[PDB]
Amino acid sequence: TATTLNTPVVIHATQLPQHVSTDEVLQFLESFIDEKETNLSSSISQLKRIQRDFKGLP
Amino acid sequence: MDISKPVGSEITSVDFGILTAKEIRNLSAKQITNPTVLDNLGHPVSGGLYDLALGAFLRNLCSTCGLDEKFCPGHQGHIELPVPCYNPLFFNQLYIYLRASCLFCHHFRLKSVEVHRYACKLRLLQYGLIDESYKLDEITLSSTLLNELKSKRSEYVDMAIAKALSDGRTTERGSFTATVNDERKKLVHEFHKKLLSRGKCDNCGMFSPKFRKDGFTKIFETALNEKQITNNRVKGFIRQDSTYILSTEVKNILDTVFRKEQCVLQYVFHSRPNLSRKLVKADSFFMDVLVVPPTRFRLPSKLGEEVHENSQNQLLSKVLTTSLLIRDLNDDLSKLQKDKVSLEDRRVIFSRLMNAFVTIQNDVNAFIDSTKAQGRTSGKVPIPGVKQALEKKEGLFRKHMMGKRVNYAARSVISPDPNIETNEIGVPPVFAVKLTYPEPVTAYNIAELRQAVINGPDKWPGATQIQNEDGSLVSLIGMSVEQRKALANQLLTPSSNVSTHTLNKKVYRHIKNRDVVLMNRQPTLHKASMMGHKVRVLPNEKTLRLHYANTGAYNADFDGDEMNMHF
Amino acid sequence: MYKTEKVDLALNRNRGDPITQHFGFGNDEWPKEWLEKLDEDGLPYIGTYVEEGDPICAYFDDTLNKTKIKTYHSSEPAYIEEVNLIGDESNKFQELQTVSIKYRIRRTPQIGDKF
Amino acid sequence: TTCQFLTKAVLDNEREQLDSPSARIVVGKLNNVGTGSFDVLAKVPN
Amino acid sequence: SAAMYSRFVKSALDDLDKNDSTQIGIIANQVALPSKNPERINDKNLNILLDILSSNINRIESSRGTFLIQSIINFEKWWELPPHTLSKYIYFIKILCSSIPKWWQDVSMILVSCFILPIKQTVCHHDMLKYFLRMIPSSMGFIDTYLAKFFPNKNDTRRKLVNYTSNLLKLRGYCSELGFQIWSLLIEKIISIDVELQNELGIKELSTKLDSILTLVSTHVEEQVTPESLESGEGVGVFNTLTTLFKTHVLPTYYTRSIQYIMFHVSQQQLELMDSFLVTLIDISFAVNEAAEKKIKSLQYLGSYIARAKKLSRTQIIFVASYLTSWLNRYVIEREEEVDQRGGMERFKHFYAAFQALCYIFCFRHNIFRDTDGNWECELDKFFQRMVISKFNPLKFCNENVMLMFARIAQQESVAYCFSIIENNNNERLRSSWSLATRQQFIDLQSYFPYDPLFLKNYKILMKEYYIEWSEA
Amino acid sequence: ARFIKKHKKQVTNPIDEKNGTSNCIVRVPIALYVSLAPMYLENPLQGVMKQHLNPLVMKYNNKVGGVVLGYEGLKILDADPLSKEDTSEKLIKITPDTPFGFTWCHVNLYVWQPQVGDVLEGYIFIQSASHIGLLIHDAFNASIKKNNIPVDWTFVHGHWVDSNGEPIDGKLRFTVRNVHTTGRVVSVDGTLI
Amino acid sequence: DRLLNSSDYTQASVCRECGSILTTQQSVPRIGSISTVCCRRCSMRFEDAKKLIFIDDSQIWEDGQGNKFVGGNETTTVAIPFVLKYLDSELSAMGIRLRYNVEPK
Amino acid sequence: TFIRGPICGTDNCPSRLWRIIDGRRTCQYGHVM
Amino acid sequence: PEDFQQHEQIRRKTLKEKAIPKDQRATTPYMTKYERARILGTRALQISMNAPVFVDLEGETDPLRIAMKELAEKKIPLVIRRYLPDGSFEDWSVEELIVD
Ligand SMILES: [Zn+2]
Ligand SMILES: [Zn+2]
Ligand SMILES: [Zn+2]
Ligand SMILES: [Zn+2]
């Protein structure tokens, strides 16, 4: 479970969230997936599935 | 305290204030109503003082969090007082404002203009503006002039604070030094003296009946004197456009005065600017509920084999009985019409009510406070109330903060030794084998700590246990040499867990010559009676050995005097 | 040094009450290492070396249906010197409830002793 | 006279700024004297 | 009955829309009973209750419905239900966790805990895990921790342990992404295997335990790793994670007898697996960053491996000799000058460590280093002598028993003559200095050989094809 | 007079074109106060990533009110307020009691934040008489309860059938009723009325 | 160490919002969910909160008795001497409130 | 050293608690909590 | 929310204006006996938990001794923040302070 070693003491948004186009979501997924190549493995796997959908696939 | 459990949040200041009956009711885990504490099978009575909502008790689990007597922090509940009581802490201040009041126009009997002059000064002092508060008094150019005077003093205070904020001299949080605090305290004293110094109200010209007290918090009202009743009806046309007095009457009087005189009170009751913007209410001097502290602060005691009830519970249950009893008086009281109904019962109902109020007020006094309680059965000596527990004997500060009972460490008769260094202390193996530093295991010490763990609890220099990365301890006590050799070979295995990956194991070793302890001989009247010595373990010794060069510092004689060794 | 301790298992009983606890052993299953320190009566053999935690007394408790044991408490080991059976008056009939055990502690003179 | 000074603090709605040695011991804060009179920071490259 | 019960429940649900909640609770309590109590709801009625609840699960997704649901998830030995009824329970659970993912947490926990049960009895549990891992991939988190939580203890029954690993292997084969964490768990059991066996080298217990576990693990790996599986498969994945766990657990702790034979054995499945291991060992034993003790442990591993691993090719061996003499020749050429300078012979731990490994390798495989001519690969005749007479005086600082055996063999082969240097060495001894505070750990480290013979009955037999006993060499 | 009511779902998620769904992917800048372990003293960004950020990926986070997809542009705020935002040497204050640092950081989060009211599309993966189970973006769980499906829709043994008697399949368009976030993984409650 | 470590060192929960160390408790969760740390002062009884927008799931917690609450999730832990808790407790018996200002907010 | 009670706070027992005066409490395999 | 950001920036800015220009520093260029002890202890603590070490250990097993060694070669990556009584401060690097 959560300790000061794996969890931020506090988190705050500094701005209102800005919506992003599909073309942007794709450019971000692209680079984030590349840069990060057990929990992280199974997660980029899921991201890989999402980027697949944003390109229209299965 | 563990260097591998850091804390991110930090307390930076503490604010003093008063619990409102609304807060209490909201936070409460259970309303307590039963004087009886246990049943025939020793279980907590529901709605009683050991009710399990207030925390785990004995075997039982806490009904609020579900935790055991060990991990359950306890939770507070409340008692509902069927009738308002004066908070015994504040009764003197209540007395001052009550006496100062005009029961007719509901301002203080001190002329409004003066009261405003105090409000101006105190407000300036919230910002530390001492010079300005004297300049305020320099302001002068009958009721039309006065409001212009009030007004121009007011615009001076604003201008001064504005100016003070623009340059360096203050923040919106105020400025509070000793010289400021001194000026503030004088003014409040001066103000209170002037409040009580008035007879006739300077504002409406009427006389209010005088109020008198007890040392047991009862308030009497002395009816009006002859000249004064005459004076009062002469002013009768302008207004057209002894006895015990209940705490409820007193509260109503102050409630209104606090509304009217709110401006001044806003600064009398705040040494800093009141950013919170909360009104100053009369309720603050009264209690409609009592907070029942958590069960873990009210446990029974065992005097050897016999078990004794908790004294704070004995006091709280007396509040509880009186409470039920008043809730019954209140029940029969409503079953009047007496639209029919013959008057005199009015006198007897009052008699019973006075009785209830007095004795609950006594029980509260006794707790804050046994002082405020009527001495029992002439003898016995009073039982301490909460006030006396916090203040009793030498007190929490002296008995548990200045000084403490301590845990790791040792004590022994000292013996002289010319053969150790003047900065060492000769430690007997009997100590050396039981005292451990918690040593964190690293590349640089894995050899050493392996050996310690192999050596075990009883061969010096050894070890008594291992702390794992998940904080858990493993005892080396019951163990064979092989089991120990096994644990010694897994001291430095990698992490199989991301959450503890930053930690290493710890070995609770015996201490050695590399080490430093703190030596102490009492009385400790200067710092050299508590110094750091380098450890030197000496075979076959049963006492602490100390070089002569240190007697001076410790004032030690070697006549069977003892020292403490702290690790 | 000699210390005398009084073991009196009539300490709880409410005055001339039925007797729950009697010196001796029950027939339930209990350690057996106990007989190293204690004779058949549940009293310790005279002369026995006794260190912290050892039995100095054994009785059978009725309310527990178990055989229990008063243990030696000093951190300084000792030997049993005298064991006195303090019988009761008020004409016999009453069984053993009170015992005095006198411990003997060796003092070869130590560091810190005063002369 | 603990309860007297406490009563005074409450009626002033005082804030304990926690600067005195006594106050810091009360709340468990590192003392303002001594090796505590400055902060330490690490110079990190890259 | 049949239709009476259909009414009873249908009523209960109406009564639940009204919040009376009694009828349901009566039912729930009836299903919650233990596998033993005769009064627990029987199959036929349960068939009914289930098929009715499945048909409109939304009727139950309420605070009032919680208790009923909890009682069905907690149905004892459900995997033990009769075919037809078992099927209705499964369909219900399927239906439940689909419309309400929240309960998947509760269902899977119980599932994992059933991993202590034999393979034949778990099909339904895996079928369900496979299903919901797919549809709720986010679950992998907490369900992984379950893998931790419910691992049988070392004390617990062997059948429990052997089962709970059999299942984890099965799980691995349909939820790859958990694959590493799994292998990490088994290995970290790892430490218990290290516990079992070295000290002993009850004990009869740990033997057959640790023996049943390893033989399992390795046979599953023999199947998981195969050339077909290596080009297009997850064979690669398994080797990787087993090699990683070797570098992080086996090597350091580095006094294990159970356990390093997993790598000994997988290694020798295919030529490249061997290649990867050798070069991996070489890396660790000569990397500039690593701590000297790590370099010394690797070098022991390296030497033990080359000596023992039967499936090694002449040239892979000569490869290691060629690396060692090469690295050694350089050491002496660049460093001998530092000996008569200030410091001790410990400055050269690493030199002796490597020279040991090479000597050791020569003991077991000297018959190979003679090429067709009868000449020595790597000029071993000329090379050994040079080191033996160097200023490092290896013979004095390396393991005593190996240096002795090397002497014997080397002398026999006209390769080198050390025996006078030895004489001189323990003469100078009776009458080149190293503390001994730290000199012992080295003697300790040089005494351990991670692939000296195994003492576990079965594993031994299994290893024979992959092992060279001293008698063989 | 009192506003805890600043935990009210303000998504707003816009409807799309050329399309009909709501775009719920959003980029939010955050500040976060985190610990830095001593092992990372030479790699502080690496350490902030491995300790704090990586574990946030593909989990719901209560503060950004959605699932965190990932992060860009991590920056440590130097405890030395006098340095240039440029320099690669920074100060991190060390705990009095422990060797751990604590620093503020700025980073950018990409968040999938489906609020109530939004229109999403899911891939049908399961059909009982009790609910329809969908997968949004082939990643997040959705579920339409039996009585959020319109009344004239019927069921068979199984698979659903609509208002006009034809079976439904694959992509389905629904509106967000509630978003459950406290379980192991996020789950969306959707409606068709 | 002596006050610090011997003394009665204790990691304790505070509500960052009301500044109390006496009104926090562990939530009691449904099976499968994880317990969280909540403030009894700063949270509404569930009924009363409905009676005044949609309410998120993470914002509800329950005690052992069974009452549901909305809010009160602004808690952390601070290191205090245990005897502080006793003093604060006694003070609240006397109707007095200590309010600890915690940072970071 | 026995008291049987309090099983063991380690889910690979539960093996069987004796308390030492130092308050570690010790279970046979050798958890000290 | 936008303005708390602003509030923080103001706090942090004024703190630095206390924490001051390098070239306007005015306190002793000598490391104080207090600063030395804490620097040693704290750096020793970090060493005990696998901080990258900037010097050759040469057999040392006491992390305090390792720190002392680092101090001697001026390889301790710590900075002392000295507070003047108004709360403003001067940052001094361990390497730049004269040690004795
Ligand atoms: Zn509790
Ligand atoms: Zn008046
Ligand atoms: Zn709160
Ligand atoms: Zn255990």
Swiss-Prot record, chain A:
Keywords: DNA-directed RNA polymerase, Nucleus, Phosphoprotein, Ribosome biogenesis, Transcription. The keyword Signal does not apply. One of its GO terms (cellular component) is nucleus. GO terms for biological process: nucleolar large rRNA transcription by RNA polymerase I; regulation of cell size; ribosome biogenesis; termination of RNA polymerase I transcription; transcription by RNA polymerase I; transcription elongation by RNA polymerase I; transcription initiation at RNA polymerase I promoter. One of its GO terms (molecular function) is DNA-directed RNA polymerase activity. The N-terminus is blocked. It is found in: Nucleus, Nucleolus. Present with 3100 molecules/cell in log phase SD medium. DNA-dependent RNA polymerases catalyze the transcription of DNA into RNA using the four ribonucleoside triphosphates as substrates. Component of RNA polymerase I (Pol I) which synthesizes ribosomal RNA precursors. RPA14 seems to play a role in the stability of subunits RPO26 and RPA43. In vitro, the RPA14-RPA43 subcomplex binds single-stranded RNA. This is DNA-directed RNA polymerase I subunit RPA14. It comes from Saccharomyces cerevisiae (strain ATCC 204508 / S288c). The gene is RPA14. The chain holds residues 12 to 100 of 137 of the full protein.
Swiss-Prot record, chain E:
It is found in: Nucleus. The keyword Endoplasmic reticulum does not apply. GO terms for cellular component: nucleolus; nucleus. Keywords: Nucleus, Transcription, Transcription regulation. Its main location: nucleus. It holds the Pfam family RRN3. GO terms for molecular function: rDNA binding; RNA polymerase I core binding; RNA polymerase I general transcription initiation factor activity; RNA polymerase I general transcription initiation factor binding. Disulfide bonds: none annotated. GO terms for biological process: transcription initiation at RNA polymerase I promoter. PANTHER family: RNA POLYMERASE I-SPECIFIC TRANSCRIPTION INITIATION FACTOR RRN3-RELATED, TRANSCRIPTION INITIATION FACTOR IA RRN3. Present with 138 molecules/cell in log phase SD medium. Belongs to the RRN3 family. Monomer. Interacts with NOP53. Required for efficient transcription initiation by RNA polymerase I. Interacts with Pol I in the absence of template DNA and stimulates recruitment of Pol I, but does not remain as part of stable preinitiation complex. This is RNA polymerase I-specific transcription initiation factor RRN3. It comes from Saccharomyces cerevisiae (strain ATCC 204508 / S288c).
From Swiss-Prot, chain G:
Signal peptide: none annotated. It is found in: Nucleus, Nucleolus. A zinc finger (C4-type) spans 15-42. The modification Phosphoserine is found at residue 58. Changing residue 18 to A: Lethal. Abolishes recruitment of RPA1 to Pol I. No effect. Component of the RNA polymerase I (Pol I) complex consisting of 14 subunits: RPA135, RPA190, RPC40, RPA14, RPB5, RPO26, RPA43, RPB8, RPA12, RPB10, RPC19, RPC10, RPA49 and RPA34. The complex is composed of a horseshoe-shaped core containing ten subunits (RPA135, RPA190, RPB5, RPO26, RPB8, RPB10, RPC10, RPA12, RPC19 and RPC40) where RPA135 and RPA190 form the DNA-binding cleft. Outside of the core, RPA14 and RPA43 form the stalk that mediates interactions with transcription initiation factors and newly synthesized RNA. Three distinct zinc-containing RNA polymerases are found in eukaryotic nuclei: polymerase I for the ribosomal RNA precursor, polymerase II for the mRNA precursor, and polymerase III for 5S and tRNA genes. Present with 14100 molecules/cell in log phase SD medium. Belongs to the RNA polymerase beta chain family. This is DNA-directed RNA polymerase I subunit RPA135. It comes from Saccharomyces cerevisiae (strain ATCC 204508 / S288c) (Baker's yeast). The gene is RPA135. The chain holds residues 1090 to 1203 of 1203 of the full protein.
Swiss-Prot record, chain I:
The keyword Transcription applies. One of its GO terms (biological process) is tRNA transcription by RNA polymerase III. The keyword Ubl conjugation does not apply. It comes from the Eukaryota. Keywords: Cytoplasm, DNA-directed RNA polymerase, Nucleus, Phosphoprotein, Ribosome biogenesis, Transcription. GO terms for molecular function: DNA binding; DNA-directed RNA polymerase activity. Signal peptide: none annotated. Its main location: cytoplasm. DNA-dependent RNA polymerases catalyze the transcription of DNA into RNA using the four ribonucleoside triphosphates as substrates. Common component of RNA polymerases I, II and III which synthesize ribosomal RNA precursors, mRNA precursors and many functional non-coding RNAs, and small RNAs, such as 5S rRNA and tRNAs, respectively. Pol II is the central component of the basal RNA polymerase II transcription machinery. RNA polymerases are composed of mobile elements that move relative to each other. Component of the RNA polymerase I (Pol I), RNA polymerase II (Pol II) and RNA polymerase III (Pol III) complexes. Component of the RNA polymerase I (Pol I) complex consisting of 14 subunits: RPA135, RPA190, RPC40, RPA14, RPB5, RPO26, RPA43, RPB8, RPA12, RPB10, RPC19, RPC10, RPA49 and RPA34. The complex is composed of a horseshoe-shaped core containing ten subunits (RPA135, RPA190, RPB5, RPO26, RPB8, RPB10, RPC10, RPA12, RPC19 and RPC40) where RPA135 and RPA190 form the DNA-binding cleft.
